[PDB]
Amino acid sequence: DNRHAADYQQLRERLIQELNLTPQQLHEESNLIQAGLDSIRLMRWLHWFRKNGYRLTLRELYAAPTLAAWNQLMLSRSPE
């Protein structure tokens, strides 16, 4: 189904597990900062993304810290 966006699945799992949240509590459009994910974690996640070959910058993820938008940001700016 998803392509580069399949990498997002590992993120989706990790966030749920890091925030001590559940898939029905941490929904993907839910703001991660508002869910307990600080800006350190946020940037740390970019250390994941850029290292996975994602040409994302901090501001873009920072403006909309949500799995939903990030999913879009993963796929819609990568070669697919």
Is 4:80 a contact under the CB 8 Å cutoff?
A: yes
Q: Exposed (0-12), middle (13-18) or buried (19+): which is 49, by Cβ within 10 Å?
A: buried
Distance CA 73, CA 68 (A): 9
For the chain, domains (ranges, CATH) are 1-80 (1.10.1200.10)
Tokens representing 30 are 């839910």
Experimental method: NMR
Short-list 78, 79, 80, 68, CA closest to 8: 68
Beta strands (DSSP E) in the chain are none
